[PDB]
Amino acid sequence: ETLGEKWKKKLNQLSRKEFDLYKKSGITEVDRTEAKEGLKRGETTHHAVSRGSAKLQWFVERNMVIPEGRVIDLGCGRGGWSYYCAGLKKVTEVRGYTKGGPGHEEPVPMSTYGWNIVKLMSGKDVFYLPPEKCDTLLCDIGESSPSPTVEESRTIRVLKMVEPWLKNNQFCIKVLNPYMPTVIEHLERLQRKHGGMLVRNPLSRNSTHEMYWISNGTGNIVSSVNMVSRLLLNRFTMTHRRPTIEKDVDLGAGTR
Ligand SMILES: C[S@@+](CC[C@H](N)C(=O)[O-])C[C@H]1O[C@@H](n2cnc3c(N)ncnc32)[C@H](O)[C@@H]1O
Ligand SMILES: Nc1ccc(C(F)(F)F)cc1N
Protein backbone atom coordinates (compact mmCIF):
# COMPACT_ATOMS: atom_id res chain seq x y z
CA GLU A 1 0.00 0.00 0.00
CA THR A 2 1.40 3.41 -1.00
CA LEU A 3 1.46 6.49 1.35
CA GLY A 4 -1.03 8.09 -1.07
CA GLU A 5 -3.47 5.17 -0.63
CA LYS A 6 -3.24 5.65 3.17
CA TRP A 7 -3.93 9.37 2.68
CA LYS A 8 -6.92 8.44 0.48
CA LYS A 9 -8.44 6.04 3.06
CA LYS A 10 -8.10 8.74 5.79
CA LEU A 11 -9.70 11.44 3.55
CA ASN A 12 -12.68 9.11 2.82
CA GLN A 13 -13.30 8.53 6.56
CA LEU A 14 -13.68 12.30 7.23
CA SER A 15 -17.02 13.82 8.15
CA ARG A 16 -18.17 16.72 5.94
CA LYS A 17 -17.14 19.12 8.77
CA GLU A 18 -13.59 17.56 9.08
CA PHE A 19 -13.27 17.46 5.24
CA ASP A 20 -14.21 21.20 4.98
CA LEU A 21 -11.64 22.10 7.72
CA TYR A 22 -8.93 19.92 6.05
CA LYS A 23 -9.33 20.91 2.37
CA LYS A 24 -7.78 24.46 2.61
CA SER A 25 -5.50 23.90 5.67
CA GLY A 26 -2.18 25.62 4.97
CA ILE A 27 -2.83 25.97 1.19
CA THR A 28 -2.43 29.11 -0.98
CA GLU A 29 -5.50 30.63 -2.67
CA VAL A 30 -6.45 33.74 -4.56
CA ASP A 31 -9.20 36.10 -3.29
CA ARG A 32 -12.03 35.57 -5.86
CA THR A 33 -14.44 38.19 -4.27
CA GLU A 34 -13.87 41.04 -6.84
CA ALA A 35 -13.93 38.63 -9.84
CA LYS A 36 -17.13 36.89 -8.67
CA GLU A 37 -18.99 40.25 -8.28
CA GLY A 38 -17.73 41.48 -11.67
CA LEU A 39 -18.69 38.14 -13.34
CA LYS A 40 -22.16 38.30 -11.72
CA ARG A 41 -22.59 41.79 -13.34
CA GLY A 42 -21.51 40.52 -16.79
CA GLU A 43 -18.14 42.35 -16.79
CA THR A 44 -15.92 40.97 -19.60
CA THR A 45 -12.62 42.71 -18.86
CA HIS A 46 -9.86 42.14 -16.25
CA HIS A 47 -11.48 39.20 -14.41
CA ALA A 48 -10.28 35.61 -14.59
CA VAL A 49 -13.29 33.27 -15.25
CA SER A 50 -12.05 30.77 -12.65
CA ARG A 51 -9.29 30.07 -10.10
CA GLY A 52 -7.51 28.27 -13.02
CA SER A 53 -5.87 31.43 -14.45
CA ALA A 54 -3.92 31.96 -11.19
CA LYS A 55 -3.19 28.18 -11.01
CA LEU A 56 -1.50 28.02 -14.45
CA GLN A 57 0.13 31.44 -13.80
CA TRP A 58 2.00 29.86 -10.83
CA PHE A 59 3.72 27.34 -13.19
CA VAL A 60 4.38 29.90 -16.02
CA GLU A 61 5.96 32.56 -13.71
CA ARG A 62 8.32 29.80 -12.45
CA ASN A 63 9.23 28.86 -16.11
CA MET A 64 7.91 25.26 -15.55
CA VAL A 65 5.93 25.59 -18.75
CA ILE A 66 6.51 28.45 -21.17
CA PRO A 67 3.45 28.84 -23.42
CA GLU A 68 4.29 29.66 -27.05
CA GLY A 69 2.86 29.52 -30.57
CA ARG A 70 -0.37 27.59 -30.99
CA VAL A 71 -1.60 26.55 -27.49
CA ILE A 72 -4.10 23.64 -27.11
CA ASP A 73 -6.03 23.70 -23.81
CA LEU A 74 -7.70 20.28 -23.23
CA GLY A 75 -10.61 20.41 -20.73
CA CYS A 76 -10.74 24.23 -20.86
CA GLY A 77 -14.00 24.43 -18.84
CA ARG A 78 -14.86 28.15 -18.38
CA GLY A 79 -11.47 28.98 -20.01
CA GLY A 80 -9.16 30.16 -17.18
CA TRP A 81 -5.97 28.70 -18.69
CA SER A 82 -6.91 29.88 -22.22
CA TYR A 83 -7.57 33.52 -21.29
CA TYR A 84 -4.36 33.58 -19.23
CA CYS A 85 -2.26 32.19 -22.16
CA ALA A 86 -3.88 34.65 -24.58
CA GLY A 87 -2.08 37.51 -22.83
CA LEU A 88 1.47 36.00 -23.11
CA LYS A 89 3.86 37.58 -25.72
CA LYS A 90 5.10 34.18 -27.23
CA VAL A 91 1.53 32.88 -27.69
CA THR A 92 -0.01 33.32 -31.19
CA GLU A 93 -3.20 31.16 -30.92
CA VAL A 94 -5.28 29.50 -28.17
CA ARG A 95 -7.67 26.64 -28.98
CA GLY A 96 -9.63 25.35 -25.96
CA TYR A 97 -11.76 22.17 -25.98
CA THR A 98 -14.23 21.12 -23.29
CA LYS A 99 -17.00 18.53 -22.97
CA GLY A 100 -19.85 20.78 -21.68
CA GLY A 101 -23.40 19.59 -21.00
CA PRO A 102 -24.75 18.18 -17.72
CA GLY A 103 -22.10 17.83 -14.98
CA HIS A 104 -19.64 20.02 -17.00
CA GLU A 105 -18.74 23.73 -17.20
CA GLU A 106 -19.40 25.73 -20.39
CA PRO A 107 -16.83 28.24 -21.83
CA VAL A 108 -17.35 31.87 -20.65
CA PRO A 109 -16.91 34.56 -23.38
CA MET A 110 -14.50 37.29 -22.21
CA SER A 111 -12.73 40.39 -23.64
CA THR A 112 -9.59 40.11 -21.49
CA TYR A 113 -6.20 40.90 -23.10
CA GLY A 114 -5.59 38.83 -26.24
CA TRP A 115 -9.20 37.52 -26.42
CA ASN A 116 -9.11 37.70 -30.26
CA ILE A 117 -6.57 34.80 -30.51
CA VAL A 118 -8.84 32.50 -28.35
CA LYS A 119 -11.36 29.96 -29.64
CA LEU A 120 -13.14 27.83 -26.96
CA MET A 121 -15.25 24.95 -28.23
CA SER A 122 -17.69 23.04 -26.07
CA GLY A 123 -19.27 19.65 -26.89
CA LYS A 124 -15.73 18.27 -27.47
CA ASP A 125 -14.85 15.11 -25.57
CA VAL A 126 -11.03 14.91 -25.88
CA PHE A 127 -11.11 11.10 -25.70
CA TYR A 128 -12.70 11.16 -29.18
CA LEU A 129 -10.54 13.91 -30.72
CA PRO A 130 -7.72 13.35 -33.22
CA PRO A 131 -4.47 15.10 -32.18
CA GLU A 132 -3.58 18.48 -33.77
CA LYS A 133 -0.36 20.33 -34.58
CA CYS A 134 0.50 22.65 -31.64
CA ASP A 135 3.48 24.27 -29.90
CA THR A 136 2.05 24.00 -26.34
CA LEU A 137 -0.14 21.20 -24.94
CA LEU A 138 -2.11 21.96 -21.78
CA CYS A 139 -4.50 19.49 -20.10
CA ASP A 140 -6.44 19.98 -16.83
CA ILE A 141 -8.71 16.91 -16.96
CA GLY A 142 -9.16 14.39 -14.15
CA GLU A 143 -12.35 13.95 -12.13
CA SER A 144 -11.83 13.05 -8.46
CA SER A 145 -13.51 9.96 -7.01
CA PRO A 146 -13.59 8.32 -3.54
CA SER A 147 -12.25 5.25 -5.43
CA PRO A 148 -8.50 5.50 -6.19
CA THR A 149 -8.94 2.59 -8.69
CA VAL A 150 -11.50 4.79 -10.61
CA GLU A 151 -8.93 7.66 -10.39
CA GLU A 152 -6.09 5.33 -11.58
CA SER A 153 -8.15 4.50 -14.71
CA ARG A 154 -9.05 8.19 -15.33
CA THR A 155 -5.42 9.24 -14.89
CA ILE A 156 -3.92 6.52 -17.18
CA ARG A 157 -6.61 7.34 -19.81
CA VAL A 158 -5.54 11.06 -19.74
CA LEU A 159 -1.81 10.12 -19.93
CA LYS A 160 -2.38 7.89 -22.93
CA MET A 161 -4.69 10.45 -24.68
CA VAL A 162 -2.23 13.41 -24.37
CA GLU A 163 0.87 11.52 -25.66
CA PRO A 164 0.30 12.01 -29.47
CA TRP A 165 -0.40 15.74 -28.79
CA LEU A 166 3.20 15.64 -27.30
CA LYS A 167 6.00 15.74 -29.78
CA ASN A 168 8.74 18.10 -28.65
CA ASN A 169 6.29 20.70 -27.26
CA GLN A 170 5.86 22.75 -24.09
CA PHE A 171 3.34 21.02 -21.82
CA CYS A 172 1.46 21.21 -18.51
CA ILE A 173 -0.75 18.14 -17.77
CA LYS A 174 -2.80 17.40 -14.67
CA VAL A 175 -2.08 13.98 -13.12
CA LEU A 176 -5.18 13.43 -10.95
CA ASN A 177 -3.81 10.40 -9.07
CA PRO A 178 0.00 10.19 -9.30
CA TYR A 179 0.48 7.74 -6.38
CA MET A 180 -1.02 4.54 -7.74
CA PRO A 181 1.81 2.11 -8.83
CA THR A 182 0.49 1.63 -12.40
CA VAL A 183 0.30 5.46 -12.77
CA ILE A 184 3.95 5.79 -11.59
CA GLU A 185 4.98 3.13 -14.27
CA HIS A 186 3.35 5.17 -17.09
CA LEU A 187 4.77 8.47 -15.77
CA GLU A 188 8.33 7.03 -15.62
CA ARG A 189 7.99 5.78 -19.21
CA LEU A 190 6.64 9.21 -20.37
CA GLN A 191 9.42 11.10 -18.55
CA ARG A 192 12.10 8.84 -20.24
CA LYS A 193 10.60 9.75 -23.68
CA HIS A 194 9.36 13.38 -23.24
CA GLY A 195 11.27 14.54 -20.11
CA GLY A 196 9.78 16.99 -17.66
CA MET A 197 8.86 16.57 -13.98
CA LEU A 198 5.85 16.20 -11.60
CA VAL A 199 5.18 19.38 -9.53
CA ARG A 200 2.73 20.00 -6.69
CA ASN A 201 0.99 23.41 -7.08
CA PRO A 202 0.48 25.24 -3.69
CA LEU A 203 -2.91 26.44 -4.93
CA SER A 204 -4.18 22.81 -5.10
CA ARG A 205 -6.52 21.87 -2.22
CA ASN A 206 -5.50 19.19 0.29
CA SER A 207 -8.57 17.13 -0.80
CA THR A 208 -6.73 16.23 -4.09
CA HIS A 209 -3.30 14.56 -4.55
CA GLU A 210 -3.08 16.02 -8.07
CA MET A 211 0.38 16.98 -9.44
CA TYR A 212 1.16 18.48 -12.80
CA TRP A 213 3.54 17.02 -15.36
CA ILE A 214 5.37 20.10 -16.72
CA SER A 215 7.88 20.09 -19.59
CA ASN A 216 10.65 22.33 -18.13
CA GLY A 217 12.12 20.37 -15.25
CA THR A 218 13.84 17.18 -14.17
CA GLY A 219 13.67 14.90 -11.13
CA ASN A 220 12.63 11.67 -9.42
CA ILE A 221 8.85 11.20 -9.78
CA VAL A 222 8.46 8.56 -6.96
CA SER A 223 10.39 10.87 -4.57
CA SER A 224 8.20 13.93 -5.45
CA VAL A 225 4.96 11.85 -5.16
CA ASN A 226 5.90 10.51 -1.71
CA MET A 227 6.80 14.06 -0.47
CA VAL A 228 3.24 15.17 -1.42
CA SER A 229 1.72 12.08 0.31
CA ARG A 230 3.75 12.97 3.50
CA LEU A 231 2.68 16.65 3.25
CA LEU A 232 -1.02 15.75 2.89
CA LEU A 233 -0.83 13.19 5.72
CA ASN A 234 0.83 15.76 7.97
CA ARG A 235 -1.99 18.21 7.29
CA PHE A 236 -4.45 15.79 9.06
CA THR A 237 -2.36 16.02 12.33
CA MET A 238 -3.08 19.59 13.35
CA THR A 239 -5.83 22.20 13.68
CA HIS A 240 -6.78 23.94 10.40
CA ARG A 241 -4.14 26.50 9.31
CA ARG A 242 -5.85 29.35 7.47
CA PRO A 243 -4.64 29.59 3.84
CA THR A 244 -2.29 32.17 2.38
CA ILE A 245 -4.74 34.55 0.57
CA GLU A 246 -3.33 36.40 -2.44
CA LYS A 247 -4.64 38.88 -4.93
CA ASP A 248 -6.26 37.28 -7.95
CA VAL A 249 -4.85 37.90 -11.49
CA ASP A 250 -5.80 40.86 -13.67
CA LEU A 251 -6.07 39.67 -17.27
CA GLY A 252 -6.60 43.24 -18.57
CA ALA A 253 -8.40 44.16 -21.78
CA GLY A 254 -8.03 44.72 -25.54
CA THR A 255 -6.86 42.83 -28.61
CA ARG A 256 -3.38 41.55 -29.48
C1 LIG B 1 -10.50 21.25 -13.59
S1 LIG B 1 -11.51 21.84 -14.91
C2 LIG B 1 -10.42 22.88 -15.88
C3 LIG B 1 -10.41 24.33 -15.35
C4 LIG B 1 -9.69 25.24 -16.35
N1 LIG B 1 -8.25 24.87 -16.44
C5 LIG B 1 -9.83 26.72 -15.97
O1 LIG B 1 -8.76 27.37 -15.79
O2 LIG B 1 -10.99 27.20 -15.90
C6 LIG B 1 -11.48 20.42 -15.95
C7 LIG B 1 -12.54 20.58 -17.04
O3 LIG B 1 -12.37 19.44 -17.91
C8 LIG B 1 -13.65 19.13 -18.44
N2 LIG B 1 -13.62 17.77 -18.98
C9 LIG B 1 -13.72 16.59 -18.28
N3 LIG B 1 -13.64 15.52 -19.03
C10 LIG B 1 -13.49 16.03 -20.32
C11 LIG B 1 -13.39 15.40 -21.58
N4 LIG B 1 -13.53 14.09 -21.76
N5 LIG B 1 -13.26 16.20 -22.67
C12 LIG B 1 -13.27 17.53 -22.50
N6 LIG B 1 -13.39 18.23 -21.36
C13 LIG B 1 -13.48 17.41 -20.30
C14 LIG B 1 -14.63 19.39 -17.31
O4 LIG B 1 -15.93 19.65 -17.81
C15 LIG B 1 -14.01 20.63 -16.63
O5 LIG B 1 -14.59 21.84 -17.12
N1 LIG C 1 -23.30 22.73 -18.74
C1 LIG C 1 -24.62 22.28 -18.74
C2 LIG C 1 -25.39 22.34 -19.93
C3 LIG C 1 -26.74 21.90 -19.94
C4 LIG C 1 -27.30 21.42 -18.76
C5 LIG C 1 -28.72 20.90 -18.71
F1 LIG C 1 -29.58 21.71 -18.12
F2 LIG C 1 -29.26 20.64 -19.86
F3 LIG C 1 -28.85 19.75 -18.03
C6 LIG C 1 -26.58 21.36 -17.55
C7 LIG C 1 -25.22 21.78 -17.53
N2 LIG C 1 -24.43 21.70 -16.33
mmCIF file of C-alpha atoms and ligand atoms in Angstrom, residues 49-56 73-82 97-101 103-106 124-129 139-143 174 210 212, ligand 1:
data_model
loop_
_atom_site.group_PDB
_atom_site.id
_atom_site.type_symbol
_atom_site.label_atom_id
_atom_site.label_comp_id
_atom_site.label_asym_id
_atom_site.label_seq_id
_atom_site.Cartn_x
_atom_site.Cartn_y
_atom_site.Cartn_z
ATOM 1 C CA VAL A 49 -13.293 33.267 -15.253
ATOM 2 C CA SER A 50 -12.050 30.773 -12.652
ATOM 3 C CA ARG A 51 -9.288 30.065 -10.102
ATOM 4 C CA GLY A 52 -7.513 28.266 -13.024
ATOM 5 C CA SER A 53 -5.866 31.429 -14.449
ATOM 6 C CA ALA A 54 -3.916 31.958 -11.188
ATOM 7 C CA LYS A 55 -3.187 28.182 -11.005
ATOM 8 C CA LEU A 56 -1.504 28.020 -14.454
ATOM 9 C CA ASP A 73 -6.026 23.701 -23.810
ATOM 10 C CA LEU A 74 -7.700 20.277 -23.229
ATOM 11 C CA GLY A 75 -10.611 20.415 -20.726
ATOM 12 C CA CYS A 76 -10.740 24.229 -20.859
ATOM 13 C CA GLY A 77 -14.002 24.432 -18.843
ATOM 14 C CA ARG A 78 -14.855 28.145 -18.382
ATOM 15 C CA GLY A 79 -11.474 28.978 -20.007
ATOM 16 C CA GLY A 80 -9.159 30.158 -17.181
ATOM 17 C CA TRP A 81 -5.975 28.699 -18.689
ATOM 18 C CA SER A 82 -6.914 29.877 -22.215
ATOM 19 C CA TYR A 97 -11.764 22.169 -25.984
ATOM 20 C CA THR A 98 -14.230 21.118 -23.286
ATOM 21 C CA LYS A 99 -17.003 18.530 -22.967
ATOM 22 C CA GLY A 100 -19.850 20.776 -21.683
ATOM 23 C CA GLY A 101 -23.401 19.592 -21.001
ATOM 24 C CA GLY A 103 -22.102 17.833 -14.981
ATOM 25 C CA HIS A 104 -19.636 20.022 -16.997
ATOM 26 C CA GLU A 105 -18.744 23.727 -17.195
ATOM 27 C CA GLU A 106 -19.397 25.731 -20.393
ATOM 28 C CA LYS A 124 -15.726 18.275 -27.465
ATOM 29 C CA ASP A 125 -14.845 15.114 -25.568
ATOM 30 C CA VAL A 126 -11.027 14.908 -25.880
ATOM 31 C CA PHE A 127 -11.113 11.096 -25.705
ATOM 32 C CA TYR A 128 -12.702 11.160 -29.183
ATOM 33 C CA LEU A 129 -10.537 13.908 -30.719
ATOM 34 C CA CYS A 139 -4.502 19.494 -20.103
ATOM 35 C CA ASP A 140 -6.437 19.977 -16.831
ATOM 36 C CA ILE A 141 -8.711 16.906 -16.962
ATOM 37 C CA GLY A 142 -9.162 14.394 -14.150
ATOM 38 C CA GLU A 143 -12.347 13.946 -12.129
ATOM 39 C CA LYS A 174 -2.799 17.397 -14.673
ATOM 40 C CA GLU A 210 -3.083 16.017 -8.070
ATOM 41 C CA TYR A 212 1.160 18.481 -12.798
HETATM 42 C C1 LIG B 1 -10.499 21.249 -13.592
HETATM 43 S S1 LIG B 1 -11.506 21.836 -14.913
HETATM 44 C C2 LIG B 1 -10.415 22.884 -15.878
HETATM 45 C C3 LIG B 1 -10.414 24.334 -15.351
HETATM 46 C C4 LIG B 1 -9.694 25.241 -16.354
HETATM 47 N N1 LIG B 1 -8.248 24.869 -16.440
HETATM 48 C C5 LIG B 1 -9.832 26.721 -15.972
HETATM 49 O O1 LIG B 1 -8.764 27.370 -15.791
HETATM 50 O O2 LIG B 1 -10.995 27.198 -15.901
HETATM 51 C C6 LIG B 1 -11.480 20.423 -15.954
HETATM 52 C C7 LIG B 1 -12.536 20.578 -17.044
HETATM 53 O O3 LIG B 1 -12.369 19.444 -17.913
HETATM 54 C C8 LIG B 1 -13.649 19.131 -18.443
HETATM 55 N N2 LIG B 1 -13.624 17.768 -18.980
HETATM 56 C C9 LIG B 1 -13.718 16.589 -18.284
HETATM 57 N N3 LIG B 1 -13.636 15.518 -19.035
HETATM 58 C C10 LIG B 1 -13.494 16.026 -20.318
HETATM 59 C C11 LIG B 1 -13.393 15.404 -21.583
HETATM 60 N N4 LIG B 1 -13.534 14.093 -21.765
HETATM 61 N N5 LIG B 1 -13.263 16.201 -22.673
HETATM 62 C C12 LIG B 1 -13.270 17.528 -22.498
HETATM 63 N N6 LIG B 1 -13.388 18.225 -21.361
HETATM 64 C C13 LIG B 1 -13.483 17.411 -20.299
HETATM 65 C C14 LIG B 1 -14.629 19.389 -17.309
HETATM 66 O O4 LIG B 1 -15.935 19.647 -17.811
HETATM 67 C C15 LIG B 1 -14.013 20.627 -16.633
HETATM 68 O O5 LIG B 1 -14.588 21.836 -17.122
#
